[PDB]
Design a protein around this ligand. Sequence first.
Ligand code: CA
Ligand code: ZN
Lengths: 248, 94, 309, 251
Amino acid sequence: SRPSSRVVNGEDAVPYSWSWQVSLQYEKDGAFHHTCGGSLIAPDWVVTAGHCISTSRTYQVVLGEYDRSVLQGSEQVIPINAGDLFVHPLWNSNCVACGNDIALVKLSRSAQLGDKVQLANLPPAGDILPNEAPCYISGWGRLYTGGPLPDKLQEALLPVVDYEHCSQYDWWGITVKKTMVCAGGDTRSGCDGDSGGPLNCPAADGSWQVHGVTSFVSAFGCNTIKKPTVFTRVSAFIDWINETIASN
Amino acid sequence: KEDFVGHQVLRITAADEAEVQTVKELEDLEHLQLDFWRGPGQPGSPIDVRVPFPSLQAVKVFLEAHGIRYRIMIEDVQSLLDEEQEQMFASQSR
Amino acid sequence: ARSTNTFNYATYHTLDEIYDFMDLLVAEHPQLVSKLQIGRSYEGRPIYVLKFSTGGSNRPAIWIDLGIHSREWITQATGVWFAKKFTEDYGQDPSFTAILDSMDIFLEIVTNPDGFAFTHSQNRLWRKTRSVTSSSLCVGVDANRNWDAGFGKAGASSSPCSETYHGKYANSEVEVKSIVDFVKDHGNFKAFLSIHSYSQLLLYPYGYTTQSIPDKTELNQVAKSAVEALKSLYGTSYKYGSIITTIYQASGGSIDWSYNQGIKYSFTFELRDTGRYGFLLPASQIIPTAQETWLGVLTIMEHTLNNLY
Amino acid sequence: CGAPIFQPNLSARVVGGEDAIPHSWPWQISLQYLRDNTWRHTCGGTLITPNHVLTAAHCISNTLTYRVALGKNNLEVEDEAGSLYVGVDTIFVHEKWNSFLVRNDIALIKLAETVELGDTIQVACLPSEGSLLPQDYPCFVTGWGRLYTNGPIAAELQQGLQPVVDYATCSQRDWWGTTVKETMVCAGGDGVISACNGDSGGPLNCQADGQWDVRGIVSFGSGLSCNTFKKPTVFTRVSAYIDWINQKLQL
Ligand SMILES: [Ca+2]
Ligand SMILES: [Zn+2]
């Protein structure tokens, strides 16, 4: 109908509220396609999951996006130069349960930071959340396979599950490491996120902190009781993150 | 045409009948959209499968969690197809 | 290619190019080759069989079908090569020359044309036919599970959406029914070979039953000779034995059908590769695979020839 | 004739398919085709006159539009000072070229422009009609690899040695049997990591009391195993085609 009036309704995130959300896209037959979530952590740096990188591909990240089906003027498109990807050296595609599933992408040209686009807030090293911590996932739902994807940025209340609550044999057993965060695990769904998407938590300050980086979900679905969305603890990788940004 | 960017073909090895029934308990899971190149058979034989990118991590941890060994045969299927298609073009005439 | 002496055998071709090749070969060796149309595929494409002959009326024959699972692109391309091979070696190679003087060879290079047309336009890894059912939106049936051999039984799926879908009933697909009709009508068929890919395997009945075939001994021996001969050229290794014990129980396959039809020499080859590339076998391996596979095939034809019944 | 201003190497020191001294074989050209807008190299060739490149027949597709790239070393560049790109005028493929049998794999590319023939564009030397070189003779197969494809390309011009394998040897039933014919030159020796450095239609370089002669055009091999033991690289014998070359050189 030409530009239909913007309707935020249902589980749509408030436009631009999650201002550090980013979209990692691969090139294909001339066009890019959303593949993972990510968080703008530095003027010209982005953190996302390690498995979202396929070295043989051309990537770009989109900033200031909400409705992927509608140009809105806030979007910024940044082509990611050949060798500007940065997967952790310990990430091993043959042991997902081993953790260390993180990576960083240096932007070719720096983000225009403003009211609509903003830098995330990283936890302090080794920082750890309490059981039942009230965190919010955000994404375009690619974690979900059985149905059509959202055009608008979505969100969900995925309260974290502490280690000794996420380790219990009938949950994620010996598969979960002290380097990962679990969120949800109940009737509340986790399908509104993307691989590499943020697990934002409300800091002790009022501001929000990117505590996680979506790694994996259950084979049975992104909404399986006792099998919470496993995230990579972005605090365990504070040393690494900083040097990479530094040394490069 | 179909999109295969980031897909991967894995070589699963179910040591014994038990490990075989569990890789099959993943076949029933229609939502994963597995493309079994060398579907399940007698234990010992290889099980080659193309697992789509969105079902990539979930399939692995499923495997890992069950203590089932797999290696990655093809890391990115689209890139192969991309080569094939490029050879064909380079070699076309009447 | 304006002739078949400049046609590029070292690449993969579209249904068209393959159909135009059959025409040149025929137009080139009019006395040796003839293109028969055995029916039409679900979507209306003609289904061709190339007949290599020297004369006589209803001489014993060999059946060779390729491309029944369309993604297995190495089979169509080696099928095109076998075509040229047959016309170059007759009246030069005494082993083959001796065969084309007593029997006929029917070669079906593209057994599933719609599926094949689909792998070039939509989904490279498509393997089934392209029929539609009234009770489902998923398209296709595993044509190599649609034969009337232990059909419907274990080793096949009944869900139209599975890649191993057996189809509504034995021979329900026209691609299969066409051959069943042609083969049954001819009646003088002594060998039946179906080429596939991959696994580097040479199998003989049965795939459904655990029941042994009346002559496992002989066929098995033929297998070691052919596996042997195939290894000569470059050392590539095949394993061999009957379907069910060498892979898994599979229902409704061609060679179990052939065999029950009395075509004693029934085998299936599972061409190159082992998994490194699988269906996406690089083109540099078309000729080589073609060559080595040829040697093992000649052996079977030659055995057939010496053991006519 | 075949005399470079950038001395290449010999069996000097470098082990494995040496990269190459930027510009040490100035008759090495890269044959490219267009697709959308990008030009992509498929085959190698040899400059033999300020407007003629000898190349393999199997490298020609009547449908493609080609360009010839002169004076290069790194394919991922478009300046390198002494470099060029020249359109083709006519490609005369040997009228007896046979695809199935891969017999007479030759073709002559009549360029369309003078081709400056500078300090990095040089013409190799054609052998003497009939020359049947000694087995084991040291020759070098240059090229950007692109033959077996599946291996980190070779943006860097490669070069590696190949020892003439005599016909008598090649033709051995357990070698390249009948496939081969006295019109072909064999080469390639027991490798070591191998890594196909020459492209299809690449040149087989050899010295002749100084200057280098193009003794071969790369024709065929095994597919997966470039430099398999007892399966050498088969090239086309340029000497066996001097009259043809000289007949088409004037068209
Ligand atoms: Ca938008
Ligand atoms: Zn098959």
